[PDB]
């Protein structure tokens, strides 16, 4: 029973590995929720604390720039870098208040967005020097469009620099050669990275479009790797599930059976978060400056109905419940 | 032309006093916008940067708690403390990007809420020892409902702690004793706080309820009262703050500024404006159901392009910043950098 499960706030290094090993041996996945604001991270940290669970918070290139502000010029990645750094501090500062472990991660970063990556690593190293931990728990590379040699080669390059701070790296491989991801292809990724550090996960292509989903393939990766490595471990790899929304409870089950520790959500939550605020369209009669349908026809004050603290909270509550659904479906609810 | 007019990020210490003196000398005031989310601080910073203006961002007790999340128990001021600190780091982290000097302030703290004040002040100090700087630029005490010798008493003790950090204290005095606040009472505050440090500002009851009419002229009375009993030459020995005065005329704002108001608080107006742009996303209500869009096809064509919060939340930002840009024109702070 690793320390991680009793901790509170953002975790790093060995705590991230222990948590992922705990997930594999207790058989649950941890949802990874894309966030774009303090409000949406509040929604996720709440759903997580309430169901006594660990959570992964991620920022995409676009979500990171939202934290910066859409009016901040991002031609140079200046917004995604500032925004992600801004969200990192905010999340670090508030996460302990909810009393769970939080993995802080960045989402998909393709080859043309590598400067977004480079800026985060700089800030990471700088932060690591002053404080003993990086800023982010985890970072993702998605060079699945490149050939696999380039993809694995430059992941190793970054990974070597990431490993100096114990940071976690998530890597994606698709079907680019020089259809699903072959287990051989996935083991090649393991070969190079495990030479550097064991703190890495892999997201493969198994029908999870983002003709359908063959979660049984992830077991084939795990099994192939077993043989090659010559190990007893059921789950020699750490695996991630991309494009998760719409898959049945049974699909998520074999995926988790096959070593998946993390399932990404985003646009499900996106919609969820909207519902609560959308459903406040019952009050459009009370959502003008002073005109109220109710009492005092035009002399009533609508402050109590237009306070964003009132209606944004509706979005938080509705997003949280969607997340809670997941936390149960992924068997993560109650694992602390 | 003080150095602050060319800085980016949360300013501290003398820069704050430097900003206020320029505000008094050039005769503008600075809107303080209450904020509750990253989304809302973005709206304010973007309005400041676009209208080339300094800006004050503040957090009320319930604003801080919101930043922490409404599902967090605040009964020991536990959410307002965490939430104000987490908002402080985010604002500090993002402010430089907008290329603007920012004052990071905290709104009305009464006697019942002073746990919150101690929680914020302990963390300011921990952070000072590590960085040479507190988190917040200034804080407000509002002990106007207590007797004025008790109001000024605790302010002085807290100000003595804050002055080690160059931190700015804002104090509110009302009509109680120990109708409008007199100049005599106001100069009492200045009498006590000026011992500790210059970096403070007064909010007095001059009919700005938050019956009596609003009379900005009294602010001049305070200045000329303090002026005489100091004996100095300068028009404004006091730093003065305008609370709850939205919907006052441009003339009423103009006389308050010329009496040395440097900070006008805005809260509900921005709230309504923020909602405005998101509410106007009525419009796409038919696109606001999971996957079927009444437009192109009822299954086949999807809606994620319209339900993305990065789209519609931004609309609230844009209308909130527009309300803030009017304020910077009305308070003449527009284009002062
Ligand atoms: Zn992917
Ligand atoms: Zn007041």
Swiss-Prot record, chain B:
Annotated signal sequence range: none
GO biological process, one term: cellular response to xenobiotic stimulus
Domain of life: Eukaryota
Compartmental location: Cytoplasm
Manner of cofactor binding, per the entry note: Binds 2 Zn(2+) ions per subunit. One is catalytic and the other provides a structural contribution.
Principal place of residence: cytoplasm
Residues of the active site: 107 (proton donor)
Keyword Nucleotide-binding recorded: no
Entry binding sites for Zn(2+) 2: 142, 172
Keywords of this entry: Allergen, Cytoplasm, Glycolysis, Lyase, Metal-binding, Zinc
Cofactor: Zn(2+)
Entry's Gene Ontology cellular component terms: cell surface; cytosol; fungal-type cell wall; hyphal cell wall; plasma membrane
Record-listed D-glyceraldehyde 3-phosphate binding positions: 60
Binding site for dihydroxyacetone phosphate: 244-246, 265-268
Oligomer and partners: Homodimer.
Family, as annotated: Belongs to the class II fructose-bisphosphate aldolase family.
Protein name: Fructose-bisphosphate aldolase
Annotated source species: Candida albicans (strain SC5314 / ATCC MYA-2876) (Yeast)
Taxonomic lineage of the native organism: Eukaryota, Fungi, Dikarya, Ascomycota, Saccharomycotina
């Amino acid at each position: 029973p690793p320390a991680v499960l009793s901790k509170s706030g953002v975790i790093y290094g060995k705590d991230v590995k222990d948590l992922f090993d705990y997930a594999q041996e207790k058989g649950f996945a941890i949802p990874a929720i894309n966030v774009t604001s303090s409000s949406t991270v509040v929604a996720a940290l709440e759903a997580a604390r309430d169901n006594k669970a660990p959570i992964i918070l991620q920022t995409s290139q676009g979500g990171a720039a939202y934290f910066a502000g859409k009016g901040v010029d991002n031609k140079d990645q200046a917004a995604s870098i500032a925004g992600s750094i801004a969200a990192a501090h905010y999340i670090r500062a508030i996460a302990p208040t909810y009393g769970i472990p939080v993995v802080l991660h960045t989402d998909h970063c393709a080859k043309k967005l590598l400067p977004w990556f480079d800026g985060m690593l700089k800030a990471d190293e700088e932060f690591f020097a002053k404080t003993g931990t990086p800023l982010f728990s985890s970072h993702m590379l998605d060079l699945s469009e490149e050939t696999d040699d380039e993809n694995i080669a430059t992941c190793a390059k970054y990974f070597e620099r990431m490993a100096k701070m114990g940071q976690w790296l998530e890597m994606e491989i698709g079907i680019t050669g020089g259809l699903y991801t072959s287990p051989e292809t996935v083991f090649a990724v393991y070969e190079s990275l495990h030479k550097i550090s064991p703190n890495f996960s892999i997201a493969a292509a198994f029908g999870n479009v983002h003709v359908q989903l063959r979660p049984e393939i992830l077991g084939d990766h795990q099994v192939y790797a077993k043989k090659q490595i010559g190990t007893d471990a059921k789950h020699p790899l750490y695996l991630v599930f991309h494009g998760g929304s719409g898959s049945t409870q049974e699909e998520f089950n074999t995926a988790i059976k096959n070593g998946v520790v993390k399932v990404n959500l985003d646009t499900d939550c996106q919609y969820a978060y909207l519902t609560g605020i959308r459903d406040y369209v019952t009050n459009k009669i009370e959502y003008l400056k002073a005109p109220v349908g109710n009492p005092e026809g035009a002399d009533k004050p609508n402050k109590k109905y237009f306070d964003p603290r009132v209606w944004v909270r509706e979005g938080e509550k509705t997003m949280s419940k969607r997340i809670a659904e997941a936390l149960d479906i992924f068997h993560t609810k109650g694992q602390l």
